[PDB]
mmCIF file of C-alpha atoms and ligand atoms in Angstrom:
data_model
loop_
_atom_site.group_PDB
_atom_site.id
_atom_site.type_symbol
_atom_site.label_atom_id
_atom_site.label_comp_id
_atom_site.label_asym_id
_atom_site.label_seq_id
_atom_site.Cartn_x
_atom_site.Cartn_y
_atom_site.Cartn_z
ATOM 1 C CA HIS A 1305 167.876 -83.214 88.205
ATOM 2 C CA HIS A 1306 165.008 -81.566 90.114
ATOM 3 C CA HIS A 1307 166.316 -83.620 93.041
ATOM 4 C CA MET A 1308 169.188 -81.101 92.951
ATOM 5 C CA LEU A 1309 166.805 -78.114 93.063
ATOM 6 C CA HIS A 1310 165.009 -79.830 96.001
ATOM 7 C CA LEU A 1311 168.359 -80.338 97.827
ATOM 8 C CA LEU A 1312 169.422 -76.719 97.247
ATOM 9 C CA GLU A 1313 165.989 -75.406 98.378
ATOM 10 C CA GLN A 1314 166.436 -77.467 101.574
ATOM 11 C CA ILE A 1315 169.819 -75.810 102.236
ATOM 12 C CA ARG A 1316 168.578 -72.281 101.309
ATOM 13 C CA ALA A 1317 165.518 -72.784 103.555
ATOM 14 C CA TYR A 1318 167.793 -73.725 106.435
ATOM 15 C CA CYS A 1319 170.141 -70.770 105.689
ATOM 16 C CA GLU A 1320 167.058 -68.482 105.546
ATOM 17 C CA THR A 1321 166.142 -69.821 109.023
ATOM 18 C CA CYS A 1322 169.690 -69.149 110.232
ATOM 19 C CA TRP A 1323 169.828 -65.581 108.732
ATOM 20 C CA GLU A 1324 166.572 -64.768 110.539
ATOM 21 C CA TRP A 1325 168.121 -65.783 113.875
ATOM 22 C CA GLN A 1326 171.439 -64.135 112.923
ATOM 23 C CA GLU A 1327 169.808 -60.802 111.967
ATOM 24 C CA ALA A 1328 168.279 -60.783 115.488
ATOM 25 C CA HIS A 1329 171.640 -61.905 117.033
ATOM 26 C CA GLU A 1330 174.273 -59.581 115.550
ATOM 27 C CA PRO A 1331 177.341 -58.773 117.741
ATOM 28 C CA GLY A 1332 175.751 -55.551 119.087
ATOM 29 C CA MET A 1333 172.321 -57.065 119.934
ATOM 30 C CA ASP A 1334 174.171 -58.822 122.670
ATOM 31 C CA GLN A 1335 171.464 -60.757 124.605
ATOM 32 C CA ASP A 1336 170.931 -64.222 123.034
ATOM 33 C CA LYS A 1337 167.954 -66.535 122.394
ATOM 34 C CA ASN A 1338 167.871 -70.258 123.233
ATOM 35 C CA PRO A 1339 166.050 -71.385 120.085
ATOM 36 C CA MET A 1340 169.014 -71.216 117.693
ATOM 37 C CA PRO A 1341 168.454 -73.609 114.742
ATOM 38 C CA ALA A 1342 170.574 -76.782 114.761
ATOM 39 C CA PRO A 1343 171.282 -78.364 111.347
ATOM 40 C CA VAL A 1344 170.750 -81.890 112.820
ATOM 41 C CA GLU A 1345 167.042 -81.053 113.300
ATOM 42 C CA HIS A 1346 166.610 -80.011 109.630
ATOM 43 C CA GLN A 1347 168.364 -83.154 108.202
ATOM 44 C CA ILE A 1348 171.000 -80.948 106.632
ATOM 45 C CA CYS A 1349 174.125 -83.090 106.625
ATOM 46 C CA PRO A 1350 172.477 -85.729 104.322
ATOM 47 C CA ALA A 1351 171.476 -82.965 101.855
ATOM 48 C CA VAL A 1352 175.034 -81.598 101.553
ATOM 49 C CA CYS A 1353 176.409 -85.144 101.485
ATOM 50 C CA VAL A 1354 174.321 -85.873 98.369
ATOM 51 C CA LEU A 1355 175.382 -82.557 96.740
ATOM 52 C CA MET A 1356 179.049 -83.316 97.572
ATOM 53 C CA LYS A 1357 178.817 -86.766 95.914
ATOM 54 C CA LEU A 1358 177.132 -85.354 92.796
ATOM 55 C CA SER A 1359 179.691 -82.492 92.629
ATOM 56 C CA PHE A 1360 182.370 -85.037 91.585
ATOM 57 C CA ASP A 1361 180.735 -85.263 88.112
ATOM 58 C CA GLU A 1362 181.072 -82.351 85.651
ATOM 59 C CA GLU A 1363 177.601 -82.920 84.183
ATOM 60 C CA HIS A 1364 176.039 -82.474 87.658
ATOM 61 C CA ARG A 1365 178.199 -79.385 88.329
ATOM 62 C CA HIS A 1366 176.929 -77.600 85.186
ATOM 63 C CA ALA A 1367 173.463 -78.196 86.685
ATOM 64 C CA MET A 1368 174.492 -76.996 90.198
ATOM 65 C CA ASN A 1369 176.112 -73.897 88.772
ATOM 66 C CA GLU A 1370 172.934 -72.799 86.952
ATOM 67 C CA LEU A 1371 170.928 -73.360 90.162
ATOM 68 C CA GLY A 1372 173.274 -71.309 92.437
ATOM 69 C CA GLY A 1373 174.836 -74.421 94.048
ATOM 70 C CA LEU A 1374 178.185 -72.849 94.935
ATOM 71 C CA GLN A 1375 176.555 -69.826 96.615
ATOM 72 C CA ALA A 1376 174.142 -71.983 98.669
ATOM 73 C CA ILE A 1377 176.762 -74.462 99.948
ATOM 74 C CA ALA A 1378 179.214 -71.633 100.732
ATOM 75 C CA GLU A 1379 176.536 -69.677 102.669
ATOM 76 C CA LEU A 1380 175.660 -72.879 104.513
ATOM 77 C CA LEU A 1381 179.285 -73.388 105.503
ATOM 78 C CA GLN A 1382 179.690 -69.705 106.397
ATOM 79 C CA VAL A 1383 176.543 -69.488 108.500
ATOM 80 C CA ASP A 1384 177.317 -72.661 110.508
ATOM 81 C CA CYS A 1385 180.906 -71.520 111.210
ATOM 82 C CA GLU A 1386 179.579 -68.076 112.301
ATOM 83 C CA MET A 1387 176.827 -69.659 114.484
ATOM 84 C CA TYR A 1388 178.825 -72.413 116.236
ATOM 85 C CA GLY A 1389 182.469 -71.241 115.854
ATOM 86 C CA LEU A 1390 185.286 -73.778 116.393
ATOM 87 C CA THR A 1391 183.105 -76.572 117.827
ATOM 88 C CA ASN A 1392 184.090 -80.256 118.104
ATOM 89 C CA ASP A 1393 180.446 -81.325 117.496
ATOM 90 C CA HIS A 1394 180.898 -84.272 115.113
ATOM 91 C CA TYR A 1395 177.754 -83.351 113.121
ATOM 92 C CA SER A 1396 178.943 -79.762 112.549
ATOM 93 C CA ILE A 1397 182.446 -81.025 111.628
ATOM 94 C CA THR A 1398 181.008 -83.553 109.146
ATOM 95 C CA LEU A 1399 178.665 -80.926 107.671
ATOM 96 C CA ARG A 1400 181.648 -78.609 107.167
ATOM 97 C CA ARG A 1401 183.861 -81.277 105.581
ATOM 98 C CA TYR A 1402 181.159 -82.297 103.065
ATOM 99 C CA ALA A 1403 180.410 -78.675 102.197
ATOM 100 C CA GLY A 1404 184.156 -78.061 101.868
ATOM 101 C CA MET A 1405 184.570 -81.081 99.587
ATOM 102 C CA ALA A 1406 181.691 -79.815 97.424
ATOM 103 C CA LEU A 1407 183.380 -76.393 97.150
ATOM 104 C CA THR A 1408 186.703 -78.064 96.278
ATOM 105 C CA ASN A 1409 184.876 -79.868 93.420
ATOM 106 C CA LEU A 1410 182.994 -76.725 92.286
ATOM 107 C CA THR A 1411 186.189 -74.647 92.201
ATOM 108 C CA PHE A 1412 188.128 -77.316 90.261
ATOM 109 C CA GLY A 1413 189.072 -75.814 86.904
ATOM 110 C CA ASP A 1414 186.446 -73.056 87.086
ATOM 111 C CA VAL A 1415 187.865 -69.539 87.224
ATOM 112 C CA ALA A 1416 184.390 -67.932 87.691
ATOM 113 C CA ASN A 1417 183.486 -70.215 90.619
ATOM 114 C CA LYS A 1418 186.854 -69.340 92.172
ATOM 115 C CA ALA A 1419 186.120 -65.598 91.816
ATOM 116 C CA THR A 1420 182.572 -66.053 93.054
ATOM 117 C CA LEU A 1421 183.748 -67.982 96.112
ATOM 118 C CA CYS A 1422 186.478 -65.363 96.711
ATOM 119 C CA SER A 1423 183.924 -62.504 96.397
ATOM 120 C CA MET A 1424 181.885 -64.105 99.229
ATOM 121 C CA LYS A 1425 184.111 -62.517 101.876
ATOM 122 C CA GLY A 1426 182.373 -63.799 105.015
ATOM 123 C CA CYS A 1427 182.665 -67.321 103.691
ATOM 124 C CA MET A 1428 186.384 -66.801 103.035
ATOM 125 C CA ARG A 1429 186.919 -65.489 106.582
ATOM 126 C CA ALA A 1430 185.102 -68.529 107.966
ATOM 127 C CA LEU A 1431 187.143 -70.890 105.719
ATOM 128 C CA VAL A 1432 190.391 -69.323 106.923
ATOM 129 C CA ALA A 1433 189.267 -69.584 110.581
ATOM 130 C CA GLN A 1434 188.696 -73.362 110.219
ATOM 131 C CA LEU A 1435 192.458 -74.007 109.850
ATOM 132 C CA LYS A 1436 192.486 -73.716 113.668
ATOM 133 C CA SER A 1437 189.824 -76.480 114.001
ATOM 134 C CA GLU A 1438 191.053 -79.504 115.966
ATOM 135 C CA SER A 1439 189.800 -81.820 113.203
ATOM 136 C CA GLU A 1440 192.740 -82.353 110.867
ATOM 137 C CA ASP A 1441 190.279 -83.933 108.437
ATOM 138 C CA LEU A 1442 188.478 -80.566 108.319
ATOM 139 C CA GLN A 1443 191.853 -78.792 108.004
ATOM 140 C CA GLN A 1444 192.775 -80.925 104.962
ATOM 141 C CA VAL A 1445 189.449 -80.064 103.282
ATOM 142 C CA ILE A 1446 189.827 -76.319 103.937
ATOM 143 C CA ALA A 1447 193.430 -76.365 102.699
ATOM 144 C CA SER A 1448 192.177 -78.155 99.537
ATOM 145 C CA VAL A 1449 189.687 -75.322 98.883
ATOM 146 C CA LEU A 1450 192.301 -72.596 99.402
ATOM 147 C CA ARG A 1451 194.631 -74.579 97.127
ATOM 148 C CA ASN A 1452 192.114 -74.718 94.241
ATOM 149 C CA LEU A 1453 191.276 -71.013 94.774
ATOM 150 C CA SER A 1454 195.003 -70.113 94.574
ATOM 151 C CA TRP A 1455 195.785 -72.056 91.366
ATOM 152 C CA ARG A 1456 195.373 -69.973 88.162
ATOM 153 C CA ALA A 1457 193.299 -67.364 89.954
ATOM 154 C CA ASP A 1458 192.320 -63.948 88.521
ATOM 155 C CA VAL A 1459 193.663 -60.698 90.042
ATOM 156 C CA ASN A 1460 190.745 -60.143 92.449
ATOM 157 C CA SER A 1461 190.784 -63.703 93.751
ATOM 158 C CA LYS A 1462 194.537 -63.418 94.477
ATOM 159 C CA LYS A 1463 193.924 -60.059 96.172
ATOM 160 C CA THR A 1464 191.145 -61.553 98.308
ATOM 161 C CA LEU A 1465 193.200 -64.633 99.356
ATOM 162 C CA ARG A 1466 195.855 -62.189 100.544
ATOM 163 C CA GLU A 1467 193.448 -59.766 102.302
ATOM 164 C CA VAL A 1468 191.711 -62.489 104.388
ATOM 165 C CA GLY A 1469 195.153 -63.624 105.626
ATOM 166 C CA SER A 1470 195.108 -67.125 104.151
ATOM 167 C CA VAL A 1471 198.925 -67.288 103.797
ATOM 168 C CA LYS A 1472 199.716 -66.679 107.479
ATOM 169 C CA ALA A 1473 196.856 -68.954 108.608
ATOM 170 C CA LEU A 1474 198.104 -71.785 106.359
ATOM 171 C CA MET A 1475 201.731 -71.398 107.492
ATOM 172 C CA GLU A 1476 200.709 -71.397 111.186
ATOM 173 C CA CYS A 1477 198.451 -74.384 110.449
ATOM 174 C CA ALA A 1478 201.365 -76.271 108.797
ATOM 175 C CA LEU A 1479 203.455 -75.895 112.002
ATOM 176 C CA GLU A 1480 200.875 -77.870 114.055
ATOM 177 C CA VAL A 1481 199.719 -80.608 111.630
ATOM 178 C CA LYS A 1482 200.459 -84.204 112.660
ATOM 179 C CA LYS A 1483 199.188 -86.168 109.661
ATOM 180 C CA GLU A 1484 201.055 -86.255 106.348
ATOM 181 C CA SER A 1485 197.693 -86.096 104.516
ATOM 182 C CA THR A 1486 196.818 -82.703 106.051
ATOM 183 C CA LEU A 1487 200.343 -81.349 105.565
ATOM 184 C CA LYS A 1488 200.283 -82.332 101.877
ATOM 185 C CA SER A 1489 197.172 -80.194 101.231
ATOM 186 C CA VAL A 1490 198.359 -77.310 103.435
ATOM 187 C CA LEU A 1491 201.738 -77.085 101.643
ATOM 188 C CA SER A 1492 200.135 -77.379 98.153
ATOM 189 C CA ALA A 1493 198.035 -74.329 98.994
ATOM 190 C CA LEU A 1494 201.088 -72.456 100.310
ATOM 191 C CA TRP A 1495 203.143 -73.351 97.217
ATOM 192 C CA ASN A 1496 200.352 -71.886 95.025
ATOM 193 C CA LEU A 1497 200.052 -68.742 97.214
ATOM 194 C CA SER A 1498 203.827 -68.193 97.484
ATOM 195 C CA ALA A 1499 204.108 -67.650 93.702
ATOM 196 C CA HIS A 1500 201.414 -64.870 93.528
ATOM 197 C CA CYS A 1501 203.389 -61.863 94.762
ATOM 198 C CA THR A 1502 206.159 -60.559 97.026
ATOM 199 C CA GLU A 1503 203.790 -59.828 99.967
ATOM 200 C CA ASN A 1504 202.748 -63.526 100.183
ATOM 201 C CA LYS A 1505 206.425 -64.539 100.202
ATOM 202 C CA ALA A 1506 207.137 -62.006 102.974
ATOM 203 C CA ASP A 1507 204.176 -63.208 105.036
ATOM 204 C CA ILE A 1508 205.477 -66.820 104.880
ATOM 205 C CA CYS A 1509 208.940 -65.688 106.051
ATOM 206 C CA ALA A 1510 207.400 -63.491 108.787
ATOM 207 C CA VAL A 1511 205.854 -66.424 110.750
ATOM 208 C CA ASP A 1512 207.989 -67.611 113.709
ATOM 209 C CA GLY A 1513 209.543 -71.033 113.078
ATOM 210 C CA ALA A 1514 208.233 -71.135 109.468
ATOM 211 C CA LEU A 1515 211.593 -70.925 107.702
ATOM 212 C CA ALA A 1516 213.096 -73.557 110.023
ATOM 213 C CA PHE A 1517 209.989 -75.716 109.448
ATOM 214 C CA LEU A 1518 210.384 -75.324 105.674
ATOM 215 C CA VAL A 1519 214.067 -76.293 105.796
ATOM 216 C CA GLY A 1520 212.938 -79.344 107.837
ATOM 217 C CA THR A 1521 210.545 -80.410 105.044
ATOM 218 C CA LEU A 1522 213.620 -80.846 102.815
ATOM 219 C CA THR A 1523 214.482 -84.019 104.814
ATOM 220 C CA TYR A 1524 210.905 -85.169 105.616
ATOM 221 C CA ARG A 1525 210.579 -88.960 106.062
ATOM 222 C CA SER A 1526 207.331 -90.020 104.331
ATOM 223 C CA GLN A 1527 205.489 -93.050 105.707
ATOM 224 C CA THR A 1528 203.460 -93.149 102.462
ATOM 225 C CA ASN A 1529 206.572 -93.568 100.228
ATOM 226 C CA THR A 1530 206.084 -90.307 98.318
ATOM 227 C CA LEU A 1531 208.184 -87.177 97.846
ATOM 228 C CA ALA A 1532 205.237 -84.740 97.937
ATOM 229 C CA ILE A 1533 206.248 -83.032 101.186
ATOM 230 C CA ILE A 1534 209.889 -82.531 100.145
ATOM 231 C CA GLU A 1535 208.715 -81.271 96.736
ATOM 232 C CA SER A 1536 206.133 -78.787 98.038
ATOM 233 C CA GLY A 1537 208.152 -77.598 101.057
ATOM 234 C CA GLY A 1538 211.206 -77.202 98.822
ATOM 235 C CA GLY A 1539 209.005 -75.377 96.260
ATOM 236 C CA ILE A 1540 207.751 -72.847 98.810
ATOM 237 C CA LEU A 1541 211.352 -72.275 99.958
ATOM 238 C CA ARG A 1542 212.449 -71.730 96.358
ATOM 239 C CA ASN A 1543 209.691 -69.144 95.820
ATOM 240 C CA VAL A 1544 210.441 -67.280 99.090
ATOM 241 C CA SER A 1545 214.267 -67.500 98.669
ATOM 242 C CA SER A 1546 214.260 -64.367 96.465
ATOM 243 C CA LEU A 1547 213.353 -62.375 99.589
ATOM 244 C CA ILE A 1548 215.480 -64.488 102.009
ATOM 245 C CA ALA A 1549 218.509 -63.558 99.891
ATOM 246 C CA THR A 1550 218.067 -59.921 101.046
ATOM 247 C CA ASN A 1551 217.584 -60.735 104.754
ATOM 248 C CA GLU A 1552 220.686 -61.718 106.784
ATOM 249 C CA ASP A 1553 218.517 -62.851 109.731
ATOM 250 C CA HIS A 1554 216.548 -65.241 107.471
ATOM 251 C CA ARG A 1555 219.731 -66.553 105.823
ATOM 252 C CA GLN A 1556 221.046 -67.211 109.354
ATOM 253 C CA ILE A 1557 217.916 -69.275 110.170
ATOM 254 C CA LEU A 1558 218.696 -71.285 106.994
ATOM 255 C CA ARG A 1559 222.330 -71.698 108.142
ATOM 256 C CA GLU A 1560 221.065 -72.778 111.608
ATOM 257 C CA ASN A 1561 219.241 -75.656 109.858
ATOM 258 C CA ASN A 1562 221.982 -76.709 107.395
ATOM 259 C CA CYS A 1563 219.924 -75.500 104.429
ATOM 260 C CA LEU A 1564 222.707 -75.021 101.856
ATOM 261 C CA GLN A 1565 224.188 -78.436 102.621
ATOM 262 C CA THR A 1566 220.837 -80.232 102.111
ATOM 263 C CA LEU A 1567 220.169 -78.255 98.900
ATOM 264 C CA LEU A 1568 223.464 -79.548 97.464
ATOM 265 C CA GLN A 1569 222.389 -83.148 98.314
ATOM 266 C CA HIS A 1570 219.123 -82.404 96.474
ATOM 267 C CA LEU A 1571 221.175 -81.645 93.321
ATOM 268 C CA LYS A 1572 221.779 -85.425 92.957
ATOM 269 C CA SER A 1573 218.124 -86.427 93.453
ATOM 270 C CA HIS A 1574 216.258 -88.447 90.838
ATOM 271 C CA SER A 1575 213.106 -86.370 91.440
ATOM 272 C CA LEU A 1576 213.242 -83.594 88.832
ATOM 273 C CA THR A 1577 211.108 -81.265 90.990
ATOM 274 C CA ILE A 1578 213.536 -81.633 93.940
ATOM 275 C CA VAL A 1579 216.546 -80.880 91.708
ATOM 276 C CA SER A 1580 214.786 -77.936 90.047
ATOM 277 C CA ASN A 1581 213.596 -76.456 93.372
ATOM 278 C CA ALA A 1582 217.176 -76.679 94.758
ATOM 279 C CA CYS A 1583 218.742 -75.091 91.640
ATOM 280 C CA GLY A 1584 216.212 -72.259 92.010
ATOM 281 C CA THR A 1585 216.857 -71.721 95.719
ATOM 282 C CA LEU A 1586 220.619 -71.880 95.138
ATOM 283 C CA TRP A 1587 220.344 -69.346 92.294
ATOM 284 C CA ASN A 1588 218.869 -66.830 94.779
ATOM 285 C CA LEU A 1589 221.037 -67.611 97.812
ATOM 286 C CA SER A 1590 224.271 -67.608 95.711
ATOM 287 C CA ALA A 1591 223.784 -63.867 94.958
ATOM 288 C CA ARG A 1592 224.684 -60.822 97.094
ATOM 289 C CA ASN A 1593 226.256 -62.738 100.057
ATOM 290 C CA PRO A 1594 229.976 -63.513 100.463
ATOM 291 C CA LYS A 1595 229.386 -65.764 103.499
ATOM 292 C CA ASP A 1596 227.023 -68.182 101.663
ATOM 293 C CA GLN A 1597 229.055 -67.980 98.453
ATOM 294 C CA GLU A 1598 232.107 -69.111 100.365
ATOM 295 C CA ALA A 1599 230.211 -71.904 102.122
ATOM 296 C CA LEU A 1600 228.954 -73.182 98.729
ATOM 297 C CA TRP A 1601 232.505 -73.118 97.297
ATOM 298 C CA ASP A 1602 233.749 -74.938 100.417
ATOM 299 C CA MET A 1603 231.015 -77.578 100.100
ATOM 300 C CA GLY A 1604 231.872 -78.397 96.441
ATOM 301 C CA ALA A 1605 228.864 -76.578 94.933
ATOM 302 C CA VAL A 1606 230.746 -75.418 91.818
ATOM 303 C CA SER A 1607 231.358 -78.964 90.567
ATOM 304 C CA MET A 1608 227.854 -80.135 91.577
ATOM 305 C CA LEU A 1609 226.153 -77.288 89.684
ATOM 306 C CA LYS A 1610 228.461 -77.824 86.685
ATOM 307 C CA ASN A 1611 227.084 -81.408 86.367
ATOM 308 C CA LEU A 1612 223.555 -80.023 85.725
ATOM 309 C CA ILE A 1613 224.191 -77.238 83.149
ATOM 310 C CA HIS A 1614 223.597 -79.709 80.265
ATOM 311 C CA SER A 1615 220.318 -81.027 81.683
ATOM 312 C CA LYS A 1616 217.461 -81.583 79.232
ATOM 313 C CA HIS A 1617 215.128 -80.135 81.928
ATOM 314 C CA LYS A 1618 215.258 -76.413 81.200
ATOM 315 C CA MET A 1619 214.756 -74.973 84.732
ATOM 316 C CA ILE A 1620 217.569 -77.229 86.020
ATOM 317 C CA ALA A 1621 219.910 -76.170 83.199
ATOM 318 C CA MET A 1622 219.071 -72.484 83.641
ATOM 319 C CA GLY A 1623 219.045 -72.605 87.465
ATOM 320 C CA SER A 1624 222.298 -74.546 87.796
ATOM 321 C CA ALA A 1625 224.087 -72.326 85.274
ATOM 322 C CA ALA A 1626 222.900 -69.072 86.924
ATOM 323 C CA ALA A 1627 223.988 -70.340 90.373
ATOM 324 C CA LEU A 1628 227.316 -71.519 88.931
ATOM 325 C CA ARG A 1629 227.801 -68.058 87.392
ATOM 326 C CA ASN A 1630 227.189 -66.339 90.783
ATOM 327 C CA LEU A 1631 229.872 -68.484 92.449
ATOM 328 C CA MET A 1632 232.414 -68.147 89.584
ATOM 329 C CA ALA A 1633 231.902 -64.335 89.570
ATOM 330 C CA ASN A 1634 232.524 -64.124 93.347
ATOM 331 C CA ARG A 1635 235.463 -66.309 94.344
ATOM 332 C CA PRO A 1636 236.380 -65.921 98.018
ATOM 333 C CA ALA A 1637 239.789 -64.467 98.973
ATOM 334 C CA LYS A 1638 241.238 -67.926 99.772
ATOM 335 C CA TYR A 1639 240.393 -68.960 96.174
ATOM 336 C CA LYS A 1640 242.074 -67.517 93.039
HETATM 337 C C1 LIG B 2358 198.194 -78.418 87.186
HETATM 338 S S1 LIG B 2358 199.086 -79.417 88.335
HETATM 339 C C2 LIG B 2358 199.058 -78.566 89.797
HETATM 340 N N1 LIG B 2358 200.195 -78.170 90.420
HETATM 341 C C3 LIG B 2358 200.135 -77.495 91.583
HETATM 342 C C4 LIG B 2358 198.904 -77.188 92.152
HETATM 343 C C5 LIG B 2358 197.757 -77.592 91.477
HETATM 344 C C6 LIG B 2358 196.376 -77.347 91.978
HETATM 345 O O1 LIG B 2358 196.180 -76.629 92.944
HETATM 346 N N2 LIG B 2358 195.441 -78.020 91.317
HETATM 347 C C7 LIG B 2358 194.059 -78.112 91.723
HETATM 348 C C8 LIG B 2358 193.195 -77.120 90.962
HETATM 349 C C9 LIG B 2358 193.192 -77.304 89.449
HETATM 350 C C10 LIG B 2358 192.338 -76.282 88.730
HETATM 351 O O2 LIG B 2358 191.602 -75.517 89.398
HETATM 352 O O3 LIG B 2358 192.391 -76.241 87.483
HETATM 353 C C11 LIG B 2358 193.597 -79.531 91.458
HETATM 354 O O4 LIG B 2358 193.991 -80.127 90.462
HETATM 355 N N3 LIG B 2358 192.797 -80.048 92.383
HETATM 356 C C12 LIG B 2358 192.278 -81.402 92.328
HETATM 357 C C13 LIG B 2358 193.155 -82.330 93.185
HETATM 358 C C14 LIG B 2358 194.580 -82.282 92.684
HETATM 359 C C15 LIG B 2358 194.925 -82.963 91.514
HETATM 360 C C16 LIG B 2358 196.239 -82.901 91.039
HETATM 361 C C17 LIG B 2358 197.209 -82.148 91.715
HETATM 362 C C18 LIG B 2358 198.522 -82.086 91.233
HETATM 363 C C19 LIG B 2358 199.485 -81.331 91.918
HETATM 364 C C20 LIG B 2358 199.137 -80.641 93.081
HETATM 365 C C21 LIG B 2358 197.825 -80.705 93.560
HETATM 366 C C22 LIG B 2358 196.857 -81.455 92.883
HETATM 367 C C23 LIG B 2358 195.545 -81.522 93.357
HETATM 368 C C24 LIG B 2358 190.859 -81.425 92.845
HETATM 369 O O5 LIG B 2358 190.467 -80.533 93.590
HETATM 370 N N4 LIG B 2358 190.133 -82.490 92.498
HETATM 371 C C25 LIG B 2358 188.836 -82.806 93.080
HETATM 372 C C26 LIG B 2358 188.110 -83.847 92.215
HETATM 373 C C27 LIG B 2358 187.755 -83.402 90.791
HETATM 374 C C28 LIG B 2358 187.177 -84.552 89.976
HETATM 375 C C29 LIG B 2358 186.786 -82.240 90.812
HETATM 376 C C30 LIG B 2358 189.000 -83.354 94.495
HETATM 377 O O6 LIG B 2358 190.086 -83.718 94.899
HETATM 378 N N5 LIG B 2358 187.895 -83.464 95.221
HETATM 379 C C31 LIG B 2358 187.863 -84.133 96.510
HETATM 380 C C32 LIG B 2358 186.561 -83.934 97.286
HETATM 381 C C33 LIG B 2358 187.833 -83.227 97.744
HETATM 382 C C34 LIG B 2358 188.520 -83.717 98.972
HETATM 383 C C35 LIG B 2358 189.216 -82.776 99.728
HETATM 384 C C36 LIG B 2358 189.895 -83.158 100.880
HETATM 385 C C37 LIG B 2358 189.868 -84.492 101.299
HETATM 386 C C38 LIG B 2358 189.165 -85.439 100.553
HETATM 387 C C39 LIG B 2358 188.491 -85.054 99.390
HETATM 388 N N6 LIG B 2358 197.854 -78.273 90.323
#
C-alpha cells in the first residue's frame, strides 16, 4: 500500500500546516489570526476514515506502523483538540472519533504502540480532555483507547496514564454518562486502571459520589440483556475495597447504599465474575471492622460463604474461605 503512504502524507501535510499556525499562536503570543486551517477544507476526515477502516486488519497495521501511522493520527487528533477545544462541530467530532478508533486498533495487543502513544504526552492530555465532550459517541471511543492503553501496559505507560489524570477524568465521566454503550467502555478502562496501583484506587475513591455510583452499578438494569456493567462496576469496587476497608467514611458510604447486603445476593449469582468480585470485596470488608463483621453475621454471610469454599473456580474458593475465616475469627459479643 502506497495509498497508505499517500494518506499519511496528507495527514502530516495538514498537521504541518497546523503546527505552523500553532507555533505563531502559542498561549503567550496572545493576539490571534483569522486564517486558522480547518480540516474540512483539506479533505481530512475521509483520509482518517480510510486509515481507520484499514487499521482493523493486522496486515495493514504492520504497514502503518512502519510508516509512522500511529504518530501521525495521534498528532492529528492532538492538534485538532488543541486548536478547536471542546467543540460540537460535527466534522471535528467525526474526525476525532475516526482517529480515536484507529488508535484503539493500533494499540490493540501492541505494547510498543501503547508506550509510544503514552509517550506522546500532549496527545494523552487531549485524549483525557475529550471525556468532557458532549458527544457520548466520542466519549466511548476515548474510553476505548484509555482501556487498551491500560491493559497489560509497561511501567512507563502506567505511570503516564496516572500522571495525566485519566482515572479521575474517567470516574467523573462515568457519573454523567447516559448510554449503556459509553458506560461499558468507561468502566472497562477504570477496571483496568484500578488494578495498577494503590494511587489509582485512592483516586477512584476520592471522587464525590463515585463510591455510591459504583455500589449502584451492582444493581444496574441492562436494556441490552448483559451483565457487563454489574461485572465491571463490581470489579472496580473489588479492586478499590482494599483501601475502603481502612476508611470508615468510605465504609459508611457503602453502608448508606446497602453494599454488604447486595454483595451477599451476588454470592448466589450464576455469573462467575459477579460471584468472584463479591467474594473479593467481602474478603476485604470482612477484615479490621467489628461493625461490618457483625452486619455480615446478622445477614447470614457465614452460611452463604461456606457454600462457596468448595467451588471449582479458584478465586471464589479462596475469596469465600478467606472472608469466612475473617468472620469466624471475629464473632460479635452477642455470638459465642
Ligand atoms: C483479555 S480480556 C480483557 N479483560 C479486560 C480488559 C481487556 C482489554 O482492555 N482488552 C483490550 C486490549 C487487549 C490488548 O491490548 O491485548 C481489547 O481486547 N480491546 C478490543 C475490544 C475488546 C475485546 C474484548 C474485551 C473483553 C473484555 C473487556 C474488554 C474487551 C474489549 C479492541 O480494542 N478491539 C478493536 C478491534 C481489533 C480487531 C483491533 C476494536 O474494538 N476496535 C473498534 C474501532 C474501535 C471502536 C471504539 C469505540 C466504538 C466503536 C469502535 N481485556
